[PDB]
Amino acid sequence: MKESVRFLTDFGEISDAISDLLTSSPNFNVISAIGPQGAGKSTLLSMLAGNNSRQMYREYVFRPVQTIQIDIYIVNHQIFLDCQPMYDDSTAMSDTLRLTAFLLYVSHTVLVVSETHYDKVIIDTLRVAEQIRPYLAIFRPKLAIDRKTNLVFIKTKASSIDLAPTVIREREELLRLSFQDSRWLKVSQEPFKTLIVLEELNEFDEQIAELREELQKNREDFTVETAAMDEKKWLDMCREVIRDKTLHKTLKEYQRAMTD
Amino acid sequence: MDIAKWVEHARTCYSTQLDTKIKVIGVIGKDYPDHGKGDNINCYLRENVFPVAATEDETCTIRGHFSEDDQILFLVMNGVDDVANIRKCLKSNPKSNYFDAMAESECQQIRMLHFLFISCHFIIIFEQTSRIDLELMRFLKKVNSARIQLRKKINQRLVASDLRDVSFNNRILSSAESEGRMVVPRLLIAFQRLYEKLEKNLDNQFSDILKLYDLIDCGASSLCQLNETIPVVHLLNPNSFVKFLEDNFRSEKNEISLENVIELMNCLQCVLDGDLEEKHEKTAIQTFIKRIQNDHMEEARRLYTKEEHLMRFNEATHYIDSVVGVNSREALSQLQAQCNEMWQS
Protein backbone atom coordinates (compact mmCIF):
# COMPACT_ATOMS: atom_id res chain seq x y z
CA MET A 1 0.00 0.00 0.00
CA LYS A 2 1.50 3.29 -1.19
CA GLU A 3 -1.01 5.91 -0.01
CA SER A 4 -4.44 6.25 1.57
CA VAL A 5 -7.60 4.85 -0.02
CA ARG A 6 -11.22 5.77 0.58
CA PHE A 7 -12.84 3.52 3.18
CA LEU A 8 -16.39 4.39 2.08
CA THR A 9 -18.11 4.57 -1.29
CA ASP A 10 -21.35 6.36 -2.14
CA PHE A 11 -23.92 6.84 0.64
CA GLY A 12 -21.46 5.89 3.38
CA GLU A 13 -21.17 2.24 2.38
CA ILE A 14 -17.88 0.41 2.93
CA SER A 15 -15.87 0.36 -0.28
CA ASP A 16 -15.79 -3.00 -2.04
CA ALA A 17 -11.98 -2.79 -2.29
CA ILE A 18 -11.13 -2.86 1.43
CA SER A 19 -11.50 -6.57 2.17
CA ASP A 20 -8.78 -7.45 -0.35
CA LEU A 21 -6.25 -5.24 1.49
CA LEU A 22 -6.71 -7.01 4.84
CA THR A 23 -4.53 -9.92 5.90
CA SER A 24 -5.64 -12.68 8.27
CA SER A 25 -3.76 -12.07 11.50
CA PRO A 26 -5.40 -11.48 14.88
CA ASN A 27 -2.66 -8.93 15.68
CA PHE A 28 -3.93 -5.61 14.32
CA ASN A 29 -4.33 -2.09 15.68
CA VAL A 30 -6.97 0.44 14.61
CA ILE A 31 -6.18 4.14 15.10
CA SER A 32 -8.60 6.83 13.95
CA ALA A 33 -8.19 10.61 13.75
CA ILE A 34 -10.97 13.18 14.11
CA GLY A 35 -11.09 16.93 14.49
CA PRO A 36 -11.72 20.33 12.89
CA GLN A 37 -10.34 21.23 9.47
CA GLY A 38 -7.35 23.39 10.36
CA ALA A 39 -5.59 21.23 12.95
CA GLY A 40 -3.74 19.20 10.31
CA LYS A 41 -4.45 15.69 11.58
CA SER A 42 -4.07 14.22 8.09
CA THR A 43 -0.38 15.15 8.03
CA LEU A 44 0.05 14.13 11.68
CA LEU A 45 -1.69 10.77 11.29
CA SER A 46 0.51 9.95 8.29
CA MET A 47 3.65 10.70 10.32
CA LEU A 48 2.48 7.97 12.69
CA ALA A 49 1.73 5.78 9.66
CA GLY A 50 5.30 5.81 8.37
CA ASN A 51 6.46 9.12 6.91
CA ASN A 52 9.91 10.29 8.01
CA SER A 53 10.45 14.02 8.65
CA ARG A 54 11.51 15.96 5.49
CA GLN A 55 9.78 13.76 2.91
CA MET A 56 8.10 15.53 -0.01
CA TYR A 57 4.45 16.44 0.58
CA ARG A 58 3.59 14.45 -2.56
CA GLU A 59 4.75 11.29 -0.73
CA TYR A 60 2.52 11.73 2.34
CA VAL A 61 0.11 8.87 2.95
CA PHE A 62 -2.90 10.98 3.97
CA ARG A 63 -3.35 13.96 1.63
CA PRO A 64 -6.89 15.41 1.73
CA VAL A 65 -8.30 16.57 -1.60
CA GLN A 66 -19.63 12.26 -1.53
CA THR A 67 -21.33 13.30 1.71
CA ILE A 68 -19.15 11.49 4.27
CA GLN A 69 -15.73 9.95 3.80
CA ILE A 70 -12.99 8.16 5.73
CA ASP A 71 -9.50 7.37 4.46
CA ILE A 72 -7.98 3.95 5.14
CA TYR A 73 -4.30 3.03 5.24
CA ILE A 74 -2.58 -0.11 6.53
CA VAL A 75 1.03 -1.19 7.09
CA ASN A 76 2.11 -4.22 9.11
CA HIS A 77 -1.41 -4.98 10.35
CA GLN A 78 -1.76 -1.36 11.57
CA ILE A 79 -5.04 0.20 10.43
CA PHE A 80 -5.21 4.00 10.24
CA LEU A 81 -8.54 5.74 9.62
CA ASP A 82 -8.57 9.45 8.72
CA CYS A 83 -12.05 10.90 9.17
CA GLN A 84 -13.21 13.96 7.28
CA PRO A 85 -13.01 17.05 9.53
CA MET A 86 -15.87 18.11 11.79
CA TYR A 87 -18.34 20.93 11.06
CA ASP A 88 -27.52 23.12 6.90
CA ASP A 89 -26.08 23.34 10.41
CA SER A 90 -28.41 20.55 11.56
CA THR A 91 -27.23 18.02 8.96
CA ALA A 92 -23.57 18.87 9.57
CA MET A 93 -23.99 17.92 13.25
CA SER A 94 -25.75 14.68 12.35
CA ASP A 95 -23.09 13.64 9.83
CA THR A 96 -20.16 14.59 12.07
CA LEU A 97 -21.77 12.62 14.90
CA ARG A 98 -22.45 9.57 12.73
CA LEU A 99 -18.81 9.28 11.68
CA THR A 100 -17.58 9.95 15.22
CA ALA A 101 -19.78 7.25 16.77
CA PHE A 102 -18.67 4.79 14.08
CA LEU A 103 -14.94 5.37 14.58
CA LEU A 104 -15.25 5.15 18.37
CA TYR A 105 -16.80 1.68 18.05
CA VAL A 106 -14.34 0.28 15.47
CA SER A 107 -11.09 1.78 16.78
CA HIS A 108 -8.78 0.73 19.58
CA THR A 109 -7.68 4.34 20.11
CA VAL A 110 -9.02 7.56 18.55
CA LEU A 111 -6.80 10.62 18.19
CA VAL A 112 -8.80 13.81 18.82
CA VAL A 113 -6.78 16.45 16.96
CA SER A 114 -7.60 20.13 17.39
CA GLU A 115 -6.09 23.56 17.95
CA THR A 116 -8.44 24.34 20.85
CA HIS A 117 -8.01 21.91 23.74
CA TYR A 118 -9.71 22.07 26.12
CA ASP A 119 -12.79 22.46 23.85
CA LYS A 120 -16.21 21.80 25.36
CA VAL A 121 -17.97 21.45 21.99
CA ILE A 122 -15.49 18.74 20.98
CA ILE A 123 -16.08 17.03 24.33
CA ASP A 124 -19.84 17.43 23.89
CA THR A 125 -19.57 15.68 20.52
CA LEU A 126 -17.63 12.72 21.93
CA ARG A 127 -19.95 11.98 24.86
CA VAL A 128 -23.03 12.26 22.65
CA ALA A 129 -21.43 9.99 20.03
CA GLU A 130 -20.81 7.49 22.85
CA GLN A 131 -24.58 6.96 23.13
CA ILE A 132 -24.99 6.10 19.42
CA ARG A 133 -24.62 2.36 19.87
CA PRO A 134 -25.51 -0.73 17.82
CA TYR A 135 -26.70 -4.06 19.21
CA LEU A 136 -24.41 -6.80 17.85
CA ALA A 137 -25.16 -9.61 20.30
CA ILE A 138 -25.62 -12.15 17.48
CA PHE A 139 -22.20 -11.27 16.04
CA ARG A 140 -19.63 -14.08 16.19
CA PRO A 141 -16.97 -13.86 17.56
CA LYS A 142 -18.70 -12.47 20.63
CA LEU A 143 -17.74 -8.85 21.21
CA ALA A 144 -16.61 -7.21 24.43
CA ILE A 145 -19.64 -5.33 25.73
CA ASP A 146 -17.90 -3.26 28.44
CA ARG A 147 -15.05 -2.36 26.07
CA LYS A 148 -13.66 1.17 26.39
CA THR A 149 -12.08 3.05 23.48
CA ASN A 150 -8.91 5.00 24.21
CA LEU A 151 -8.84 8.73 23.43
CA VAL A 152 -5.65 10.77 22.99
CA PHE A 153 -6.25 14.50 22.64
CA ILE A 154 -3.63 16.26 20.50
CA LYS A 155 -3.30 20.06 20.45
CA THR A 156 -1.42 20.98 17.28
CA LYS A 157 0.02 24.27 16.05
CA ALA A 158 0.38 25.21 19.71
CA SER A 159 2.09 28.18 21.34
CA SER A 160 4.84 28.40 23.94
CA ILE A 161 2.38 28.75 26.82
CA ASP A 162 0.47 25.68 25.62
CA LEU A 163 3.65 23.70 26.41
CA ALA A 164 3.76 24.91 30.02
CA PRO A 165 3.37 21.80 32.22
CA THR A 166 1.02 23.77 34.47
CA VAL A 167 -1.28 24.50 31.52
CA ILE A 168 -1.22 20.90 30.27
CA ARG A 169 -2.05 19.64 33.76
CA GLU A 170 -4.98 22.06 34.08
CA ARG A 171 -6.37 20.99 30.69
CA GLU A 172 -5.73 17.27 31.24
CA GLU A 173 -7.70 17.43 34.49
CA LEU A 174 -10.74 18.74 32.60
CA LEU A 175 -10.30 15.96 30.05
CA ARG A 176 -10.21 13.31 32.79
CA LEU A 177 -13.30 14.85 34.40
CA SER A 178 -15.12 14.75 31.05
CA PHE A 179 -14.88 10.95 30.83
CA GLN A 180 -14.96 9.85 34.49
CA ASP A 181 -18.58 8.65 34.05
CA SER A 182 -18.11 7.38 30.49
CA ARG A 183 -18.96 3.73 29.82
CA TRP A 184 -17.23 3.02 26.49
CA LEU A 185 -14.64 5.83 26.33
CA LYS A 186 -11.56 6.45 28.45
CA VAL A 187 -8.54 8.71 28.79
CA SER A 188 -5.19 7.89 30.36
CA GLN A 189 -4.90 8.73 34.05
CA GLU A 190 -1.12 9.23 33.67
CA PRO A 191 0.00 12.89 33.51
CA PHE A 192 1.04 14.17 30.07
CA LYS A 193 -0.38 11.09 28.30
CA THR A 194 -3.95 12.38 27.74
CA LEU A 195 -3.17 15.77 26.16
CA ILE A 196 -0.26 15.81 23.70
CA VAL A 197 0.87 19.25 22.49
CA LEU A 198 2.94 19.90 19.36
CA GLU A 199 4.27 23.15 17.91
CA GLU A 200 3.99 24.19 14.24
CA LEU A 201 13.46 18.02 12.67
CA ASN A 202 14.87 14.73 13.94
CA GLU A 203 13.87 15.77 17.47
CA PHE A 204 10.26 16.02 16.26
CA ASP A 205 10.08 12.47 14.89
CA GLU A 206 11.45 11.09 18.16
CA GLN A 207 8.13 12.16 19.69
CA ILE A 208 6.20 10.52 16.84
CA ALA A 209 8.14 7.31 17.43
CA GLU A 210 7.53 7.58 21.18
CA LEU A 211 3.87 8.49 20.69
CA ARG A 212 3.48 5.72 18.10
CA GLU A 213 4.76 3.24 20.69
CA GLU A 214 2.38 4.49 23.39
CA LEU A 215 -0.62 4.05 21.06
CA GLN A 216 -0.05 0.28 21.20
CA LYS A 217 -0.31 0.16 25.01
CA ASN A 218 -3.78 1.08 26.30
CA ARG A 219 -5.85 -1.07 23.95
CA GLU A 220 -8.88 -3.26 24.66
CA ASP A 221 -9.80 -5.97 22.16
CA PHE A 222 -13.19 -5.99 20.46
CA THR A 223 -13.54 -9.71 21.24
CA VAL A 224 -14.31 -11.51 24.48
CA GLU A 225 -11.66 -14.08 23.51
CA THR A 226 -8.04 -13.13 22.95
CA ALA A 227 -7.08 -13.13 19.26
CA ALA A 228 -10.55 -14.33 18.21
CA MET A 229 -11.16 -11.61 15.61
CA ASP A 230 -9.32 -11.37 12.32
CA GLU A 231 -8.82 -8.02 10.62
CA LYS A 232 -11.23 -9.15 7.91
CA LYS A 233 -13.74 -10.08 10.61
CA TRP A 234 -13.13 -6.54 11.86
CA LEU A 235 -14.34 -5.29 8.48
CA ASP A 236 -17.41 -7.49 8.93
CA MET A 237 -18.01 -5.79 12.28
CA CYS A 238 -17.75 -2.42 10.55
CA ARG A 239 -20.50 -3.42 8.12
CA GLU A 240 -22.73 -4.61 10.97
CA VAL A 241 -22.49 -1.34 12.96
CA ILE A 242 -23.43 0.82 9.95
CA ARG A 243 -26.32 -1.56 9.31
CA ASP A 244 -27.65 -1.97 12.86
CA LYS A 245 -31.22 -0.72 13.20
CA THR A 246 -31.11 0.41 16.84
CA LEU A 247 -28.15 2.63 15.97
CA HIS A 248 -30.14 4.10 13.09
CA LYS A 249 -33.16 4.76 15.32
CA THR A 250 -31.07 6.58 17.93
CA LEU A 251 -29.35 8.73 15.30
CA LYS A 252 -32.72 9.89 13.98
CA GLU A 253 -33.97 10.85 17.45
CA TYR A 254 -30.80 12.94 17.76
CA GLN A 255 -31.51 14.71 14.47
CA ARG A 256 -35.01 15.43 15.79
CA ALA A 257 -33.70 16.73 19.11
CA MET A 258 -31.46 19.22 17.27
CA THR A 259 -34.15 20.59 14.95
CA ASP A 260 -36.94 20.77 17.55
CA MET B 1 -18.15 42.28 40.96
CA ASP B 2 -21.23 40.07 40.66
CA ILE B 3 -24.06 42.13 39.18
CA ALA B 4 -26.49 40.73 41.76
CA LYS B 5 -24.34 42.17 44.57
CA TRP B 6 -23.53 45.31 42.56
CA VAL B 7 -27.14 46.54 42.70
CA GLU B 8 -27.59 46.31 46.47
CA HIS B 9 -24.88 48.90 47.19
CA ALA B 10 -24.61 50.83 43.91
CA ARG B 11 -27.18 53.43 44.93
CA THR B 12 -24.95 54.65 47.78
CA CYS B 13 -21.47 54.04 46.34
CA TYR B 14 -22.32 56.37 43.43
CA SER B 15 -24.78 58.52 45.38
CA THR B 16 -23.19 61.58 43.75
CA GLN B 17 -23.60 60.32 40.16
CA LEU B 18 -27.18 59.03 40.10
CA ASP B 19 -28.10 61.54 37.36
CA THR B 20 -25.03 60.86 35.19
CA LYS B 21 -25.85 59.61 31.69
CA ILE B 22 -23.98 56.39 30.81
CA LYS B 23 -23.83 53.42 28.44
CA VAL B 24 -23.97 49.72 29.30
CA ILE B 25 -21.46 47.53 27.43
CA GLY B 26 -21.58 43.74 27.36
CA VAL B 27 -18.49 41.56 26.97
CA ILE B 28 -18.30 37.97 25.68
CA GLY B 29 -15.03 36.06 25.78
CA LYS B 30 -13.14 33.03 27.06
CA ASP B 31 -10.29 32.71 29.54
CA TYR B 32 -6.87 31.64 28.31
CA PRO B 33 -3.46 31.12 29.96
CA ASP B 34 -2.25 34.52 31.15
CA HIS B 35 -5.13 36.26 29.34
CA GLY B 36 -8.62 36.72 30.77
CA LYS B 37 -11.78 37.72 28.92
CA GLY B 38 -11.67 41.39 29.86
CA ASP B 39 -7.93 41.88 29.62
CA ASN B 40 -8.47 44.12 26.58
CA ILE B 41 -11.30 46.05 28.28
CA ASN B 42 -9.54 46.51 31.62
CA CYS B 43 -6.62 47.60 29.43
CA TYR B 44 -9.00 50.23 28.02
CA LEU B 45 -9.66 51.33 31.61
CA ARG B 46 -5.91 51.15 32.37
CA GLU B 47 -6.93 49.34 35.56
CA ASN B 48 -6.76 45.57 35.92
CA VAL B 49 -10.39 45.15 37.02
CA PHE B 50 -11.24 41.68 35.78
CA PRO B 51 -9.17 38.58 36.64
CA VAL B 52 -6.87 36.52 34.46
CA ALA B 53 -9.16 33.58 35.26
CA ALA B 54 -12.55 33.53 36.95
CA THR B 55 -12.46 31.81 40.33
CA GLU B 56 -15.02 29.26 41.47
CA ASP B 57 -16.99 31.92 43.35
CA GLU B 58 -17.21 33.99 40.14
CA THR B 59 -18.38 31.25 37.75
CA CYS B 60 -21.68 31.64 35.89
CA THR B 61 -22.09 35.27 36.89
CA ILE B 62 -22.11 38.61 35.11
CA ARG B 63 -19.32 40.77 36.54
CA GLY B 64 -19.99 44.51 36.47
CA HIS B 65 -17.60 47.42 36.83
CA PHE B 66 -18.67 51.05 36.43
CA SER B 67 -15.97 53.36 35.08
CA GLU B 68 -16.82 56.82 36.40
CA ASP B 69 -14.46 58.65 34.03
CA ASP B 70 -15.84 56.92 30.92
CA GLN B 71 -19.49 56.83 32.07
CA ILE B 72 -19.66 53.16 31.08
CA LEU B 73 -20.96 50.14 32.97
CA PHE B 74 -19.07 47.12 31.63
CA LEU B 75 -20.62 43.65 31.90
CA VAL B 76 -18.23 40.70 31.50
CA MET B 77 -19.81 37.24 31.37
CA ASN B 78 -18.30 34.24 33.14
CA GLY B 79 -19.62 31.45 30.95
CA VAL B 80 -19.51 27.68 30.63
CA ASP B 81 -15.97 27.63 29.20
CA ASP B 82 -14.17 28.83 32.35
CA VAL B 83 -11.82 26.18 33.73
CA ALA B 84 -13.25 26.83 37.19
CA ASN B 85 -16.81 26.21 35.98
CA ILE B 86 -15.98 22.91 34.29
CA ARG B 87 -14.17 21.83 37.46
CA LYS B 88 -17.11 22.88 39.64
CA CYS B 89 -19.75 21.15 37.49
CA LEU B 90 -18.00 17.78 37.10
CA LYS B 91 -16.96 17.55 40.79
CA SER B 92 -20.16 18.60 42.60
CA ASN B 93 -21.52 15.04 42.51
CA PRO B 94 -19.85 12.22 40.51
CA LYS B 95 -23.02 10.18 41.14
CA SER B 96 -24.60 12.30 38.38
CA ASN B 97 -23.53 12.33 34.72
CA TYR B 98 -21.74 14.67 32.33
CA PHE B 99 -24.89 15.81 30.52
CA ASP B 100 -26.95 16.79 33.57
CA ALA B 101 -23.84 18.36 35.12
CA MET B 102 -22.99 20.74 32.26
CA ALA B 103 -26.63 21.39 31.38
CA GLU B 104 -27.21 23.65 34.38
CA SER B 105 -24.32 25.98 33.49
CA GLU B 106 -25.45 25.96 29.84
CA CYS B 107 -28.88 27.22 30.92
CA GLN B 108 -27.36 29.99 33.04
CA GLN B 109 -25.23 31.14 30.10
CA ILE B 110 -28.43 31.41 28.07
CA ARG B 111 -30.06 33.41 30.87
CA MET B 112 -27.07 35.75 31.15
CA LEU B 113 -26.71 36.26 27.39
CA HIS B 114 -30.44 37.01 27.39
CA PHE B 115 -29.68 39.48 30.20
CA LEU B 116 -27.01 41.32 28.18
CA PHE B 117 -28.75 41.38 24.79
CA ILE B 118 -31.75 43.25 26.25
CA SER B 119 -29.81 45.79 28.33
CA CYS B 120 -26.57 46.85 26.55
CA HIS B 121 -26.04 49.60 23.99
CA PHE B 122 -23.17 47.58 22.52
CA ILE B 123 -21.95 44.01 22.94
CA ILE B 124 -18.43 43.05 21.88
CA ILE B 125 -17.35 39.45 21.26
CA PHE B 126 -13.68 38.67 21.86
CA GLU B 127 -12.43 35.67 19.89
CA GLN B 128 -8.88 34.34 19.57
CA THR B 129 -9.19 31.46 17.10
CA SER B 130 -9.45 33.64 13.92
CA ARG B 131 -12.60 31.74 12.89
CA ILE B 132 -16.07 32.77 14.01
CA ASP B 133 -17.26 30.66 16.94
CA LEU B 134 -20.37 28.85 15.71
CA GLU B 135 -20.99 27.34 19.16
CA LEU B 136 -21.55 30.91 20.33
CA MET B 137 -23.85 31.49 17.35
CA ARG B 138 -25.81 28.37 18.29
CA PHE B 139 -26.02 29.73 21.84
CA LEU B 140 -27.27 33.12 20.62
CA LYS B 141 -29.97 31.38 18.57
CA LYS B 142 -31.18 29.60 21.71
CA VAL B 143 -30.93 32.93 23.54
CA ASN B 144 -33.06 34.65 20.91
CA SER B 145 -35.60 31.81 21.15
CA ALA B 146 -35.88 32.00 24.94
CA ARG B 147 -36.15 35.79 24.59
CA ILE B 148 -39.20 35.48 22.33
CA GLN B 149 -41.11 33.30 24.81
CA LEU B 150 -40.28 35.42 27.89
CA ARG B 151 -40.46 38.91 26.35
CA LYS B 152 -44.12 39.29 27.35
CA LYS B 153 -43.47 38.39 30.99
CA ILE B 154 -40.25 40.44 31.15
CA ASN B 155 -42.04 43.46 29.66
CA GLN B 156 -44.58 43.20 32.48
CA ARG B 157 -41.66 43.55 34.91
CA LEU B 158 -40.28 46.58 33.08
CA VAL B 159 -43.72 48.15 33.52
CA ALA B 160 -43.96 47.17 37.20
CA SER B 161 -40.48 48.52 38.00
CA ASP B 162 -41.39 51.77 36.16
CA LEU B 163 -38.71 51.59 33.43
CA ARG B 164 -40.80 50.88 30.32
CA ASP B 165 -41.11 54.57 29.37
CA VAL B 166 -37.40 55.30 29.94
CA SER B 167 -35.44 55.88 26.75
CA PHE B 168 -32.20 53.94 26.33
CA ASN B 169 -30.91 56.08 23.44
CA ASN B 170 -32.30 58.22 20.63
CA ARG B 171 -33.70 55.29 18.64
CA ILE B 172 -37.44 54.65 18.77
CA LEU B 173 -38.80 51.10 18.79
CA SER B 174 -42.31 49.82 18.17
CA SER B 175 -44.17 47.92 20.89
CA ALA B 176 -43.21 44.65 19.20
CA GLU B 177 -39.54 45.53 18.73
CA SER B 178 -39.22 46.71 22.35
CA GLU B 179 -41.31 44.07 24.14
CA GLY B 180 -39.24 42.54 26.92
CA ARG B 181 -36.12 44.54 26.05
CA MET B 182 -34.70 48.03 26.47
CA VAL B 183 -32.62 48.15 23.29
CA VAL B 184 -31.50 46.21 20.23
CA PRO B 185 -27.74 46.09 20.96
CA ARG B 186 -25.16 46.83 18.29
CA LEU B 187 -22.85 43.82 18.07
CA LEU B 188 -19.07 44.07 17.68
CA ILE B 189 -16.37 41.41 17.42
CA ALA B 190 -12.61 41.66 17.98
CA PHE B 191 -10.30 38.95 16.68
CA GLN B 192 -6.96 38.25 18.36
CA ARG B 193 -3.91 37.45 16.25
CA LEU B 194 -3.54 43.72 3.05
CA TYR B 195 -5.06 43.97 6.53
CA GLU B 196 -8.04 45.87 5.10
CA LYS B 197 -9.07 43.01 2.80
CA LEU B 198 -9.36 40.63 5.77
CA GLU B 199 -11.63 42.90 7.82
CA LYS B 200 -14.07 43.37 4.93
CA ASN B 201 -14.10 39.59 4.39
CA LEU B 202 -14.80 38.80 8.04
CA ASP B 203 -17.40 41.58 8.09
CA ASN B 204 -19.23 39.79 5.27
CA GLN B 205 -18.85 36.41 6.98
CA PHE B 206 -19.93 37.82 10.35
CA SER B 207 -23.10 39.37 8.90
CA ASP B 208 -23.79 36.30 6.76
CA ILE B 209 -23.51 33.97 9.76
CA LEU B 210 -25.64 36.26 11.93
CA LYS B 211 -28.27 36.28 9.16
CA LEU B 212 -28.02 32.51 8.78
CA TYR B 213 -28.98 32.05 12.45
CA ASP B 214 -31.75 34.69 12.11
CA LEU B 215 -30.02 36.98 14.61
CA ILE B 216 -30.17 40.12 12.43
CA ASP B 217 -32.51 41.42 9.71
CA CYS B 218 -35.57 39.87 11.37
CA GLY B 219 -37.45 42.93 12.66
CA ALA B 220 -38.85 42.42 16.15
CA SER B 221 -37.50 38.84 16.14
CA SER B 222 -33.89 40.00 15.79
CA LEU B 223 -31.53 39.56 18.73
CA CYS B 224 -29.14 42.38 17.83
CA GLN B 225 -28.03 44.64 14.99
CA LEU B 226 -24.89 45.83 13.23
CA ASN B 227 -23.63 49.31 12.48
CA GLU B 228 -24.51 50.78 9.10
CA THR B 229 -21.03 52.14 8.30
CA ILE B 230 -18.93 52.20 11.47
CA PRO B 231 -16.58 49.18 11.65
CA VAL B 232 -18.04 46.10 13.31
CA VAL B 233 -15.00 43.77 13.19
CA HIS B 234 -11.58 44.64 14.61
CA LEU B 235 -8.21 42.89 14.38
CA LEU B 236 -6.31 43.20 17.65
CA ASN B 237 -2.54 43.45 17.39
CA PRO B 238 -0.35 40.67 18.85
CA ASN B 239 -4.24 52.60 20.33
CA SER B 240 -5.95 50.95 17.37
CA PHE B 241 -8.49 49.17 19.58
CA VAL B 242 -9.41 52.28 21.58
CA LYS B 243 -10.23 54.08 18.33
CA PHE B 244 -12.38 51.11 17.30
CA LEU B 245 -14.48 51.49 20.46
CA GLU B 246 -14.55 55.30 20.48
CA ASP B 247 -15.89 55.48 16.93
CA ASN B 248 -18.69 53.19 18.13
CA PHE B 249 -19.35 54.80 21.52
CA ARG B 250 -19.17 58.39 20.25
CA SER B 251 -21.82 57.65 17.59
CA GLU B 252 -24.50 57.63 20.32
CA LYS B 253 -25.24 60.37 22.85
CA ASN B 254 -25.58 59.14 26.43
CA GLU B 255 -29.23 59.19 27.49
CA ILE B 256 -30.13 56.78 30.31
CA SER B 257 -29.18 57.73 33.86
CA LEU B 258 -27.17 55.51 36.19
CA GLU B 259 -30.16 55.57 38.56
CA ASN B 260 -32.37 53.88 35.95
CA VAL B 261 -29.62 51.44 34.97
CA ILE B 262 -29.34 50.40 38.63
CA GLU B 263 -33.09 49.81 38.85
CA LEU B 264 -32.81 47.93 35.55
CA MET B 265 -30.19 45.53 36.92
CA ASN B 266 -32.49 45.01 39.89
CA CYS B 267 -35.53 44.46 37.67
CA LEU B 268 -33.83 41.98 35.32
CA GLN B 269 -32.61 39.68 38.11
CA CYS B 270 -35.70 37.54 37.50
CA VAL B 271 -34.10 36.61 34.17
CA LEU B 272 -30.97 35.32 35.91
CA ASP B 273 -33.06 33.63 38.62
CA GLY B 274 -35.37 31.97 36.07
CA ASP B 275 -38.45 33.13 37.98
CA LEU B 276 -40.41 33.47 34.72
CA GLU B 277 -39.55 30.09 33.18
CA GLU B 278 -41.68 26.96 33.23
CA LYS B 279 -40.47 24.51 35.86
CA HIS B 280 -38.43 21.53 34.69
CA GLU B 281 -37.21 22.53 31.22
CA LYS B 282 -34.47 20.37 29.71
CA THR B 283 -31.88 21.14 27.06
CA ALA B 284 -31.89 19.51 23.64
CA ILE B 285 -29.21 16.99 24.63
CA GLN B 286 -31.03 16.05 27.84
CA THR B 287 -34.26 15.43 25.92
CA PHE B 288 -32.27 13.42 23.38
CA ILE B 289 -30.81 11.30 26.18
CA LYS B 290 -34.15 10.78 27.90
CA ARG B 291 -35.86 9.84 24.61
CA ILE B 292 -33.36 7.18 23.53
CA GLN B 293 -33.40 5.66 27.02
CA ASN B 294 -37.20 5.62 27.00
CA ASP B 295 -36.97 3.78 23.68
CA HIS B 296 -34.19 1.49 24.94
CA MET B 297 -36.40 0.58 27.92
CA GLU B 298 -39.50 0.07 25.78
CA GLU B 299 -37.50 -2.23 23.49
CA ALA B 300 -35.96 -4.19 26.38
CA ARG B 301 -39.49 -4.87 27.65
CA ARG B 302 -40.32 -6.11 24.15
CA LEU B 303 -37.58 -8.74 24.41
CA TYR B 304 -38.90 -10.27 27.63
CA THR B 305 -42.22 -10.90 25.86
CA LYS B 306 -43.14 -19.56 31.43
CA GLU B 307 -40.51 -21.43 33.44
CA GLU B 308 -37.64 -19.78 31.52
CA HIS B 309 -38.33 -16.37 33.04
CA LEU B 310 -34.64 -15.91 33.81
CA MET B 311 -33.86 -16.84 30.19
CA ARG B 312 -36.00 -14.05 28.73
CA PHE B 313 -35.17 -11.74 31.65
CA ASN B 314 -31.40 -11.97 31.11
CA GLU B 315 -31.42 -11.32 27.36
CA ALA B 316 -33.10 -7.96 28.02
CA THR B 317 -30.44 -6.98 30.57
CA HIS B 318 -27.74 -7.80 28.03
CA TYR B 319 -29.44 -5.29 25.73
CA ILE B 320 -29.73 -2.50 28.31
CA ASP B 321 -26.11 -3.13 29.33
CA SER B 322 -25.16 -2.85 25.64
CA VAL B 323 -26.82 0.43 24.68
CA VAL B 324 -27.43 2.65 27.74
CA GLY B 325 -24.54 4.97 28.58
CA VAL B 326 -25.76 7.27 31.34
CA ASN B 327 -27.87 6.19 34.33
CA SER B 328 -27.18 2.60 33.27
CA ARG B 329 -27.18 1.36 36.88
CA GLU B 330 -30.61 2.90 37.54
CA ALA B 331 -31.85 1.72 34.12
CA LEU B 332 -30.99 -1.91 34.84
CA SER B 333 -32.58 -1.77 38.30
CA GLN B 334 -35.74 -0.17 36.90
CA LEU B 335 -36.27 -2.67 34.07
CA GLN B 336 -35.74 -5.85 36.09
CA ALA B 337 -38.26 -4.47 38.57
CA GLN B 338 -40.53 -4.22 35.52
CA CYS B 339 -39.64 -7.74 34.36
CA ASN B 340 -40.17 -9.29 37.79
CA GLU B 341 -43.58 -7.59 37.89
CA MET B 342 -44.59 -9.11 34.54
CA TRP B 343 -42.91 -12.36 35.57
CA GLN B 344 -45.49 -12.64 38.37
CA SER B 345 -48.50 -11.88 36.15
Numbering used by the authors:
A (entry chain B): 59 to 123, 134 to 155, 172 to 284, 305 to 364
B (entry chain A): 1 to 193, 210 to 254, 289 to 355, 381 to 420
Quote the study on this structure.
We found that SMG8–SMG9 is a G-domain heterodimer with architectural similarities to the dynamin-like family of GTPases such as Atlastin and GBP1. SMG8 and SMG9 interact with each other and inhibit the kinase activity of SMG1 in vitro. Nucleotide binding occurs at the G domain of SMG9 but not of SMG8.
SMG8c and SMG9c contain a similar globular fold with characteristic architecture of G domains along with additional secondary structure elements. The major structural difference between SMG8c and SMG9c is the presence in the former of a helical bundle of three C-terminal helices (α7–α9) that forms a stalk-like protrusion reminiscent of the stalk domain found in GTPases of the dynamin family, such as Atlastin and GBP1 (Daumke and Praefcke 2016). In particular, SMG8c helix α2A interacts with SMG9c helices α4 and α3 (patch 1) (in particular Val83SMG8, Ile86SMG8 with Leu258SMG9, Leu261SMG9). In addition, the stalk domain of SMG8c folds back on the convex surface of SMG9c (patch 2). Here, SMG8c stalk helices α2B and α7 interact with SMG9c helices α7 and α3 (e.g., Ile335SMG8 and Phe338SMG8 with Val212SMG9 and Tyr358SMG9).
